Structure 1
């Protein structure tokens, strides 16, 4: 009876406007909050904490905004990587190589023996994900199987719980390919305003639901 958790960070610009601070300061608050959230997820017994770092669309922002966001996410790993297992995946060719180099070094220095994993997905987009898998195996296998697809999806297992703060009730580019029965929870609170109580109430909601997987009781 092991569970994992996925978070869709949202609301950093609106939080900067709400607090009257720079976007840099809002992303610094995001780094702090994501370290908190990672600790909460571990305390609650989740085996992997997935964070959807970015969509492919995000990389059409300016280089300055891309560098600000990517540095803020990477700093989370800089701070916590020593005590957990870190991994990452996604449409890596759209991520500026500097962050891939640093995140690879952080993955190498993480505790691969840890029972808790922090997992970043970058450049999420189902179209890009599917095209990447196709192009990888095109003409090299007789047929695609469920095992191969599952072993090459960005998210390497089905996701149990998914939380999206920030007030948007939509999945954007972030729906996990191999999670047909993931439970979704949306809340209006901006990520940088989320408290441990907000997380706990989300968990009450998510854990109370009857999961039927398309079948009757």
Structure 2
């Protein structure tokens, strides 16, 4: 079954366009994620990676960081019984409070579910590689691809990547060990995404086996 990575982009522009607070933008994002997970389950996806943040996002003022961390965490608070939950990334950039709570939510999630919802926090290839080197430096005889795969943020290969929000770039979010990922860029702001947008993405992605 399919491994899909979702890059939810456009919450701020959506908030401004609809004349609402950024908090309401992130709440609309959380509701969309829950909706999007349901679509993914119907569509043969077994693992949904969501890029919760780039490493740079965690350098914003703490209140702004707490704002998006709280929105992503609330999704798991509401739906952790509907899937197996895990997270990974630049954990050195995340506060103790959120790491502690997300670890609790992982333990409480349905370990028997066929569907995985996995958050990647603080994505950045340079940060990822730097961290991996400094953890293993002088501790092993040689690096191999198997060892690199074991230490990478994204622990499996990604088949498809969907980026909302109109940017045609990968920013900090390219998955290190996933050379073959097919990319689909949508101009739609993430909180406006419909199932029709998702279905169009999957038809595009599926037709690449011409």
Q: TM-score, normalised by structure 2?
A: 0.98
Q: C-alpha deviations, 1:90-134, integer Å up to 9, x for none?
A: 000101121111100000001111111000000000011111111
Q: Residues 72-151 of structure 1 correspond to what in structure 2 (within 5 A)?
A: 72-151=71-150
Who is 1:158 aligned against? 157
CA RMSD of aligned residues (A): 1.0
1:114 and 1:136 map into 2 onto residues whose CA distance is 32
Count of matched residue pairs: 210
Q: How does 1:1-217 map to 2 (within 5 A)?
A: 2-210=1-209
Show structure 2 runs of 5+ residues with no match: none
Runs of 4+ that moved beyond 6 A: none
Moved more, 19-28 or 75-84: 75-84
CA distance in 2, matches of 1:78, 1:39: 16
Aligned residue in 2 for 1:215: none
Distance in 2, matches of 1:43 and 1:122, equals: 26
Paired with 1:47 and 1:98, the residues of 2 have a C-alpha distance of 29
Q: Which structure 1 residue ranges, 5 or more long, are not aligned?
A: 212-217
CA-CA distance at 1:210 after TM superposition: 2.9
